Structure 1
Amino acid sequence: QSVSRAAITAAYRRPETEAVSMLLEQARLPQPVAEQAHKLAYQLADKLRNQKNASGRAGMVQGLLQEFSLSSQEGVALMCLAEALLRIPDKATRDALGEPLIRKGVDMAMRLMGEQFVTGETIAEALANARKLEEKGFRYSYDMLGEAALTAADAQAYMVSYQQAIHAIGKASNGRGIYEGPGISIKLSALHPRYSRAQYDRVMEELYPRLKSLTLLARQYDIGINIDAEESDRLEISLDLLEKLCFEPELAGWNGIGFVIQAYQKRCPLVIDYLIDLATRSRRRLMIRLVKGAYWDSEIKRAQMDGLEGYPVYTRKVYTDVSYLACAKKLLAVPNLIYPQFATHNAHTLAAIYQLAGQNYYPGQYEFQCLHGMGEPLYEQVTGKVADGKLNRPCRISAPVGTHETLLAYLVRRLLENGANTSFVNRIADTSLPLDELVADPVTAVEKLAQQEGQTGLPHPKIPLPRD
């Protein structure tokens, strides 16, 4: 292997104490920057949580719960009475006074809960719902729902769907280009049957020509084409595919190739070193989406089943946060080589990147990204004119496209993301959790744990090593 590829392999499952300890000083924000990040994060979170006065309304309630010493059911009952009294029109009058069921249920619940996360059932429908926010300065990336093709027919169908989508997105883009215009996002698992266990030779013979074909088509329309990151044991083969792609003569001088990297992996900073070298060698600027990662629950389960020396992902959420910040700094340092795309719904992560990107923003420096049905409210404060009180930074919405038949796995990942007590989007909804704790600096949080526990970067107390 090359030096950079070798360093990736060696970090696959490195002990958490070691990985976190080495990331800490790279993630640490200089005091002045940390202070500005905190103020901004607080302001974003405050406006988001309290757009409709949720905390104030919650407080007024508690106040009356004391000025009468009433229970919850008591207060509510009183409000119902008060409500009925307020409907008296005249103030004087008022004053004076088997398995098929379970299978069907699961499928239905999937559709119902999933609707909010889906942009359109077809690319035409999805594209129709774009101008609304595109006119506000939002950008889109259409991500076809449908993954882990099981048969050759399945993979063929997905391929045809991607090709069709690129034609439609490309026509809609109408020359706007890879930055300002919409792009497409693809899953390698959709393009090759049984990708999860596919061997190198077959992937290169069968998957790669498809990846190449789609990328050439994207180039013809000058739209971005992004390669989603999936399970951790597919990282290596995805880098082999990216490497070959970047050296295609027909793609020379074109910078529309995109690639996701997952900060929850111990390999992430080493993958960045590789990507930096690859951009240099292939003479291009790579569009790199930095994300935390969507498969954490399954990654933990897989590792515990395989009984290996460790986990490929962190086991405490705050460590993933630290990884993300350290990786963000690395990406921002090389603007000639990488166009970083910072995917997050987290107000602190957003504010930290905003400050880390430094003075003198220019549109092509970087962008933020979010998922449809999750990020729009937060980014309404971000994308738009400074005169309208926004930060004037671009955000690209990832827009799932597909019917109920392709939605299941994506929906489950969204449930896990939204429902986890560690997720920012879960915690911000809790009016009980103080804003300062919500936007707490992750580096400081890690040092706090270290002081309590006796060393830095210890694994989650409830997630022992697989061999234990």
Structure 2
Amino acid sequence: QSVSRAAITAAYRRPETEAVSMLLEQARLPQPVAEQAHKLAYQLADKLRNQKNASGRAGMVQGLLQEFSLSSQEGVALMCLAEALLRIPDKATRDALGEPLIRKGVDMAMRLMGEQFVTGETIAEALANARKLEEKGFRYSYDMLGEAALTAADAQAYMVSYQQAIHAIGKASNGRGIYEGPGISIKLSALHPRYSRAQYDRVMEELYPRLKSLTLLARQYDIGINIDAEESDRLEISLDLLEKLCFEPELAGWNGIGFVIQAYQKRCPLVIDYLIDLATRSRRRLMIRLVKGAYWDSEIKRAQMDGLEGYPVYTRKVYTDVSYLACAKKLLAVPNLIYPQFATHNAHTLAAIYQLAGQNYYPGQYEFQCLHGMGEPLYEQVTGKVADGKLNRPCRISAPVGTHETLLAYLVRRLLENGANTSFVNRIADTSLPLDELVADPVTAVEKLAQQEGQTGLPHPKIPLPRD
């Protein structure tokens, strides 16, 4: 292994106290930036939570809930009475006065809950919905749903669907290019049967030609093509496929190759070192999507079943936040080698990146990204003209495309993300949680914990090492 590859391998499951301790100073926002990040986060979160005055309206209630000392069911009864009285037109009059059931229930609940996250059933239908937000400065990346191909036929169907999508998106793009125009994202698990346990030689012989073919096609249309990151035990093979791809003669001089890295992995900073080296050696700018990570629940369960030395991911959410900030700094440092794409729905994460990116923004410096159905509310404050009170930073929406038959795995990941009490999108709905706690700085949070617990970066109390 190369120096940078060896360093990745060695960091696979290193102890959390150690990993978190190393990240801390790399993630720390310089005091001035910290404060600007705080103010911007607070404001973003305020406008988002209180768009329709959901807090000021709670305040008006409690103001009467005390002046009369009434209960919940009490105050409501009064409002109904007041409503009925307001429907009196004249003021004077008002004044004077088996298993299939279960199998189907799950299918239906998935489809009902899933609609909000799907852009369209077909690529043409998704493209049709693009202009509305593209006219406002948003960009799109299309995500053909369907993964973990089980058969050769499965993988073939996915391959054909991706090709068709690229032709369609590429015709829609119409020369707009990899930054300003739409792109596509692909899952390697979709292109090779039984990817989860696939061996190196079969992946190269079979998966790679498909990856190359799609990438050449994307390049012909000059659209971005991004490789999604999946389970942690596929990181290594994904790097081998990326390595090989970046040295294809037909791809020389083209900067449309994109790759996701997951901040919840202890390996993330080390993967960045490798990528910086790869960009240098292959003479290109890589489009790098920095994400926190979508498979956390399964990663913990997987590690606990394999009874290994440790976890490949962090066990406290705040450590993932710290990792993301440290990694973001590393990416922003090398604008000649990387085009960073900062995927987040978290107002603080967004504000911190906005500040870390420094003065003198230019369009091709970086972009934000979000998931359809989750990020638009927040990024409506961000993408757009400064005169209209926006930040004038581009956001690319990831737009799932497919029918109910391909929706399951993606939906479950969205359920987990939205429903977790640690998630920003969950906590911002909790009007009992003060904005300041919601946008609290992750580094300072970690230092608080370290003081209270006796050392930095201890694992989650409820998540012991697999061997315990």
Taking structure 1 as the reference length, what is the TM-score of the superposition?
A: 1.00
Equivalent position SS for 2:165:
helix
CA positional deviation for 1:413: 0.3
Deviation at 1:97, TM superposition (A): 1.2
Give SS of 2:311's match.
coil
Give CA deviations for 1:398-422 in whole Å, capped at 9, x if unaligned: 0000000000000000000000000
- 1:161 Cα deviation (Å)? 0.2
Query: Residue in 1 aligned with 2:363?
Result: 363
The separation in 1 between residues aligned to 2:83 and 2:261, in whole angstroms, is 53
Deviation track 1:328-362 (CA, whole Å, cap 9, x = no partner) reads 00000000000000000000000000000000000
SS in 2 for 1:261: strand
Q: Matched residues in 2 for 1:32 and 1:240: separation?
A: 41
Give, in whole Å, the separation in 2 of the partners of 1:334 and 1:392. 22
How far the C-alpha of 1:296 sits from its partner, in A, is 0.2
**Secondary structure of the structure 2 residue equivalent to 1:140:** strand
Determine whether 1:461 maps to 2:456: no
Match of 1:224 in 2: 224
Q: Deviation digits for residues 59-88 of structure 1, max 9, x if unmatched?
A: 111111100000001011111111111111
SS in 1 for 2:342: strand
1:31-90 per-residue CA deviation (whole Å, 9 max, x = no partner) reads 000000000000000000001000000111111110000000101111111111111111
For residues 173 and 118 of structure 1, the distance between their equivalents in structure 2, rounded to whole angstroms, comes to 21
Kindly provide the CA deviation profile for residues 105-147 of structure 1, in whole angstroms up to 9, marking residues without a partner as x: 0000000000000000000000000000000000000001000
Give the Cα–Cα distance (whole angstroms) in 2 for the partners of residues 118 and 63 of structure 1.
Answer: 41
The correspondence of residues 236-315 of structure 1 with structure 2, limited to 5 A, is: 236-315=236-315
- SS for the counterpart of 1:340 is strand
Alignment partners' CA distance in 2, 1:58 and 1:197: 53
Per-residue Cα deviation, 1:128-169 (whole angstroms, up to 9, x for no partner): 000000000000000010000000000000000000000000
Q: Which moved more, 1:120-129 or 1:55-64?
A: 55-64
Q: Using the TM superposition, give the Cα deviation of residue 92 of structure 1 relative to its aligned residue in structure 2, in angstroms.
A: 1.0
**How far 1:175 sits from its partner (Å)?**
0.1
1:13 aligns with 13
- What is the CA–CA distance in structure 2 between the aligned matches of 1:248 and 1:291, rounded to whole Å? 27
* Structure 2 counterpart SS, 1:66: helix
CA distance in 2, matches of 1:353, 1:138: 18
In the TM superposition, what is the alpha-carbon distance from 1:375 to its structure 2 partner? Answer: 0.2
Q: Structure 1: which 4+ aligned runs deviate by more than 2 Å? A: none
Any unmatched runs of 5+ in structure 1?
A: none
Q: Percent identity?
A: 100
| SS at 2:258 equivalent | strand
What are the Cα deviations for residues 353-407 of structure 1, in whole angstroms up to 9, with x where unaligned?
A: 0000000000000000000000000000000000000000000000000000000
Q: Deviations over 1:225-275 (max 9, x none)?
A: 000000000000000000000000000000000000000000000000000
Distance (Å, rounded) in 2 between the aligned partners of 1:417 and 1:77 = 36
> Which stretch shifts more, 10-19 or 87-96?
87-96
C-alpha root-mean-square deviation of aligned residues, in Å? 0.3
- Secondary structure of 1:70's counterpart equals coil
Alignment partners' CA distance in 1, 2:86 and 2:302? 58
Aligned residue in 2 for 1:352: 352
Q: CA deviation at 1:188?
A: 0.3
**Structure 1, 71-80 or 256-265: larger mean CA deviation:** 71-80
Aligned length: 468
- How far does the alpha carbon of each residue in 1:188-216 deviate from its partner, in whole angstroms, 9 at most, with x for none? 00000000000000000000000000000
Shift, 1:101, TM fit: 0.4
d(CA) in 2 for partners of 1:101, 1:83: 42
Output the CA distance in 1 between the equivalents of 2:163 and 2:248: 19
Q: Distance in 1 between matches of 2:80 and 2:139?
A: 45
Q: How does 1:4-403 map to 2 (within 5 A)?
A: 4-403=4-403
Partner Cα separation in structure 2 for residue 169 and residue 274 of structure 1: 31
C-alpha separation in 2, matches of 1:62 and 1:20: 42
Q: Determine the C-alpha separation between the residues in 2 that align with 1:75 and 1:188.
A: 56
Alpha-carbon distance between aligned partners in 1 of 2:3 and 2:417, rounded to the nearest angstrom: 35
Distance 2:59 2:236 in 1: 52
- SS state at 2:68 partner: coil
The equivalent of 2:422 in structure 1 is: 422
What SS class does the counterpart of residue 290 from structure 1 fall into? strand
